[model samples]
Target: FNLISEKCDILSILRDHPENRIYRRKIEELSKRFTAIRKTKGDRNCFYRALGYSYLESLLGKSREIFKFKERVLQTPNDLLAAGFEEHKFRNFFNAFYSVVELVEKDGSVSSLLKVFNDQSASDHIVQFLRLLTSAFIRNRADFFRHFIDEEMDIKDFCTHEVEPMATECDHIQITALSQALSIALQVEYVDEMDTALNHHVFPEAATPSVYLLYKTSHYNILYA
Candidate 1:
């Protein structure tokens, strides 16, 4: 994909690349529903960042969805407290994130919202809060997730090493927890050219995902479909 400083028409970029032919159908389908795709830094945080921006972008202004997300976000600190995170450990982060949310609620123009997300200080704090939320979600529902560990590692260790840490890319475990915690429907479309068709997966069991993402190997990009 070509470098874009921000959101742009995804089709315009893709149609120019012959190598992208294998996935043309999927891209074309996405173009039908979503005119553009937003870009984020290609770091391990891409999945979280892309998903976070896409989710917030869906709540363009102070719509019901925005309020709904705020309601869930407001509950995070207490949820973490209940899950054994120290109040002092996350208080400032929580405060900073809430402040940004309030800012968006007041005037959530696309430009302003994108600026807040691209701003490292505001964006990372929000990302950290979401990381904590994911941690809290995993710890709170130990039994259900324990069975899916697939290795000798326990849930607590996984949360510590994978879910709570900065720069850790999300996998199935983290995605499931975040979806359940935020009550946001998530759909991940796997776009490996080798596959005859794209694979679509829903999070939290049966959520009808409103937030769409495209995943290729370890990276994620926002998808409109």
Candidate 2:
């Protein structure tokens, strides 16, 4: 699916479910805080792409934070190698992935970074880099993640088959590990076939979160709050 952003209000997403009063109220609340909702394509990679674009948007015009992220990305090769991925498989991808931030800084606009994401080849590389970072985070903290793995799977197996694979939809476990890896907080609101309070969670649970996602079953959308 192609990546694009447009002018949208939160309530517009609920057009398919006009009868749900709770969801309608929730959208109203969201609209109060977030003027618009940026949508990513509805695929397994949606969560990562949405978060990536949102994070880059947050870093616009903030040079110190951008440089800090660039530094972290610069040191990512070692982390990838340590996580058992060879540099040969990922060096070019890293270069392509990191250039978005450099270009964003040079152009001083979010549109510049969005332009890169619109290219299929460049976008795939960026999404894979995110998977790499998520895998590295999980592998680097094997002990902490061990408790979360299923009884049949070990940490390495989980990483190889689940976490690092392309197009794997993120669960809370991946979300937590990546949050810890990047030291960023993510607050997620899950809207499913429930009748009561929504399932809301704050990842990393330590610092305030700048990124927010609203999960509605198979698809995810950005939440302004």
Candidate 3:
């Protein structure tokens, strides 16, 4: 399966649940605001893949944001080291992610970004780096994340099982951490059966969202306005 697929009409989501009124109506509403959606593989890493590709795509033509993001990207290695991560363990993964960021900084094409993500070795390494980044962020701020984690598992164990492992589905805690870690705002539109209107959430509240995602039944897909 393709790691990420070409964008298709947003309304096509309705075809999956034709008999469900809530889904149909919500998708219709979504279509009014978003023109297209890009599907990603459901390998439990969809959130990172969707977020990574869409955010890089958003930076294609924005020179200023690309510079600012690149600055933040360069500082990540130190951040990870301070959080107790071994340099050798994550050096290659970090390089993989940084290469793509450098590509964007040099005005890489959308097709180039697509090519990077579709190649499983490069794509998974990027995803793993993101997971480690999120893990480091959470671990560094255990005081804040501790409250959000389940009582049974402390922050360290939580990161070990939920954030560091490959193919582990992301949750709200990880989403919040990653957004804060990279200083990238995100808007996630939750498309579910609970309501007719989609419930949208903006990470780092009230900030301008640079990445847009559609969260449907445990998977994330890129949304284009």
Candidate 4:
């Protein structure tokens, strides 16, 4: 059951409770929809559904770990038909077992995180990913959220205004994806899947990626002058 109700603006999907698409996608996927289009929680359908979305995020972290464990180190199968080692052909062989489930989950995270590049994009996704990543970190708790938020001076102002939509208290601007990978590695008490977390594709476009990619130090602020 696709949620393409023609008039089912996903921006207000969860908030509005369209009808067909609610349970079609999992709660986590549902949560991402809200991220794509968030609102003021104006008497929406189910609030716990939102929390369920958060739980799904936690579950996906473990899902990645499961996929990484099964690997082999075989060079040649039978005969050393060593005329030469085809570069791209071997590339295809080494990566035989692949699936879209992996891609979608990873892309889901990236799409949500990258929205910070677009002002009108999902702040909910940005905010949640910040909090969800806390366990992955042991330090830099303070430094991260500050730069990501609007960066107001008043503590109360930061809490009341910025905390709801954007996480001012715990912003992890860059390397969030990396931080997630490291956290998993550390949880298993080692580090090997280094590049997976540090993927440039999942990462927000830096300079070319988007304005938010350099949102911290970029001097190019779009002003309506």
Best by TM-score: 3
TM-score of 2: 0.91
RMSD in order of candidates: 2.9, 2.0, 1.6, 19.8
Error of 3 at 163 (Å): 0.5
Report the C-alpha lDDT of model 3 over 1-225, residue by residue, as the tens digit.
Answer: 399998899887777788998888888888889999998999999998888988889899788988899999999998899899999999999999999999887757888889999999999999999999999999899888766655455888888999999999999999999999988899999988886557899998989998899999899999988
Identify the leading candidate in terms of lDDT: 3
Model 4, 66-178: lDDT tens digits are 34422211322111124233445334422321221233246546343223222222323322333222322312243444455335444333333433233233233323432
lDDT of 1 by residue, 138-168 (tens): 8988887876755455888889998888899
Q: After superposition, how far is residue 69 of candidate 2 from its true place, in Å?
A: 1.1
Q: Estimate every model's Cα lDDT from 0 to 1.
A: 0.76, 0.77, 0.90, 0.27
Q: Can you rank all candidates by lDDT, best first?
A: 3, 2, 1, 4
Whose lDDT is higher: candidate 2's or candidate 4's? 2
Q: What ranges in model 3 sit over 4 Å off?
A: 147-153
- Give the lDDT of residue 39 in candidate 4: 22
Q: Which stretches of candidate 1 lie over 4 Å from their true place?
A: 1-5, 12-21, 24-26, 148-153
Least well predicted 10-residue stretch by lDDT in candidate 4: 216-225
- Quality of model 1 by C-alpha lDDT: 0.76
Deviation in angstroms for 55 in model 3?
Answer: 0.7
**Which of the two candidates, 1 or 4, achieves a greater lDDT against the reference?**
1
Error of model 2, residue 132, in angstroms:
1.3
Instruction: In model 4, state the lDDT of residue 194.
Output: 27
Q: What TM-score would you give candidate 1 relative to the actual structure?
A: 0.87
